Design a protein around this nucleic acid. Structure first.
Length: 103
DNA sequence: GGATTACACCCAAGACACCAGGCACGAGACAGAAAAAAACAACGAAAACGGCCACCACCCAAACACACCAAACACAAGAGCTAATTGACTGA
């Protein structure tokens, strides 16, 4: 488990889903902090595929897969590649609440 | 009560007479003195250690002066007016 360093997704839990042996970027599952193209011309909430299909805009639909604003790849839950130096791979140590989310 | 008159008494002057203790004179002797050998004590010739005293500091202890300094500066009352962040950096 890691946490991203920059962007709007700073200092939130990201589960390392796949580790790419290219040693440039790795696959991370993360909770989208997005407004679903309604306010921008926020709290971590479960992604809504139907709402992001209804509101329109930049969207590419592959059933459970979605490519949306920011070239964001999500499935079912964002699944996207982020740099190893753009995340902290040592020193997360999660609790049970994030495990439920992901002496 | 010293002096006068009257009265009693005894003891030394005045002789002799036995004899013997002190004086003229002579002799052994011991205190005393000249002299020698040798200390020696109050009369001077000097001092040299306890007794004052001054340099050269300390040594605290204010006196003064200089500057630094922090706090104080009448009540109330009405109104208007302006500002309460703004470049800008950096993922996207």
């Amino acid at each position: 488990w890691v946490r991203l360093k920059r962007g709007i997704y700073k200092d939130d839990i990201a589960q390392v889903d796949y580790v790419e042996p290219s040693q440039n970027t790795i696959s991370l599952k993360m909770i989208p902090r997005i407004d679903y193209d309604r306010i921008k011309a926020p709290p971590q909430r479960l992604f809504d595929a139907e709402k992001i299909r209804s509101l329109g805009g930049d969207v590419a639909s592959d059933g459970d897969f979605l490519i949306f604003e920011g070239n964001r790849y999500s499935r079912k839950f964002l699944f996207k590649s982020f740099a190893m130096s753009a995340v902290i791979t040592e020193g997360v140590k999660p609790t049970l609440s994030e495990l439920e989310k992901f002496r």
